[PDB]
Write an enzyme that holds these catalytic residues in place. Structure first.
Site, PDB file in Angstrom:
ATOM      1  N   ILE B 103       0.832  -1.224   0.000  1.00  0.00           N
ATOM      2  CA  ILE B 103       0.000   0.000   0.000  1.00  0.00           C
ATOM      3  C   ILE B 103       0.860   1.265   0.000  1.00  0.00           C
ATOM      4  CG2 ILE B 103      -0.225  -0.196   2.565  1.00  0.00           C
ATOM      5  CD1 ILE B 103      -3.156   1.161   1.895  1.00  0.00           C
ATOM      6  N   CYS B 104       0.449   2.305  -0.738  1.00  0.00           N
ATOM      7  CA  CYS B 104       0.966   3.683  -0.566  1.00  0.00           C
ATOM      8  C   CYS B 104       2.274   3.838  -1.343  1.00  0.00           C
ATOM      9  CB  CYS B 104       1.059   4.056   0.953  1.00  0.00           C
ATOM     10  SG  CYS B 104       1.489   5.834   1.452  1.00  0.00           S
ATOM     11  N   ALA B 105       3.410   3.951  -0.658  1.00  0.00           N
ATOM     12  CA  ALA B 105       4.722   4.006  -1.309  1.00  0.00           C
ATOM     13  C   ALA B 105       5.355   2.621  -1.440  1.00  0.00           C
ATOM     14  CB  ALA B 105       5.664   4.957  -0.564  1.00  0.00           C
TER      15      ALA B 105
END
Lengths: 186, 186
Positions: B103-105
């Site tokens: 998730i995300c970066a």
């Protein structure tokens, strides 16, 4: 110059609710103290995640905070409800017109300590019968704000709950930028 | 008959996405191992919350998990990206037909380790340029599944990310009950 928040971390706390309130409040430029209920030791939360508090509740008992935040979770809420220290600090916050914020099972802590009677609140649904006798219970809102009391329902409402607290202390614009960065509609 | 998840906790991890992953999976009846990147000691996260892992990554290195979960946060993703052990486990997970979730970066972790090249994924919106060359990037989608790869965008998509993993491992009825308990529409 700055706003503060006391977030009380108790054994059996709902770690998601806790972490969201701490982390969102910090994002919004608020000075968050995480105070362990019984000391400065790691707190074992409801799904067995262990979290180090910044300090103990006892060590910040003489300090003023613009908001006192009560994460939910049945066990964390039961512990805060039994704590005479939580009671003293909540009565103090109410009498100085400071914000009180409670999510999920935690509004039962208010009932247990005789705080904020007659106010509107919501909670995790299964706690409603503990909160109808001395409060106007709200069935249909994810977050409720009545004067100095902000309450909320559970994990699915924790981002909105944290952002609402943040908005009172840090303002609309700040929280809009914070919510945008979160990818949370607000 | 249970299922297992490795959640890798790294310094600078985005603590919300991390806690949501560990908690939601545990609610779904999945055996979660929280494994510290650099050892078994507390991990300081992106907003200064400190979390005790269950064990070190090194200690679960010969273990097979049904899913390997990578929380986001830029510091966390960069640390994971530099770790040969993360690489080794992602490659093994990938050869093994097992699930990977990021998730995300965190999807850039797969880029740094040359894992899942050409797969469809999403990420935190501002991280897009890191990913367009070697992956098929999907812009307007909170959770993206391609085969045994699941990716998502940020705090605002963390519940859905975790519930999507939970569904793959635990099934539709279990995740509906868990989502209901969370007060999350899913």
């Amino acid at each position: 110059m700055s706003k503060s928040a006391l977030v009380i971390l108790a054994p059996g706390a709902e770690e998601m609710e806790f972490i969201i309130a701490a982390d969102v409040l910090r994002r919004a430029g608020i000075k968050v103290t995480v105070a362990g209920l019984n000391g400065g030791e790691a707190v074992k939360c409801s799904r067995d995640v262990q979290i180090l508090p910044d300090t103990s509740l006892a060590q910040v008992a003489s300090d003023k905070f613009d908001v006192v935040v009560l994460p939910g979770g049945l066990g964390g809420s039961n512990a805060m409800g039994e704590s005479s220290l939580v009671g003293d600090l909540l009565r103090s916050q109410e009498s100085g017109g400071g914000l009180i914020a409670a999510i999920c099972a935690a509004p039962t802590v208010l009932a247990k300590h005789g705080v904020a009677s007659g106010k509107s609140l919501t909670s995790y649904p299964s706690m409603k019968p503990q909160l109808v006798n001395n409060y106007s219970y709200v069935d249909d809102k994810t977050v409720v704000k009545d004067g100095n009391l902000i309450t909320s329902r559970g994990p699915g409402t924790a981002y909105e709950f944290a952002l609402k607290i943040a908005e009172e202390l840090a303002g609309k614009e700040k929280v809009q930028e914070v919510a945008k960065g979160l990818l949370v509609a607000y």
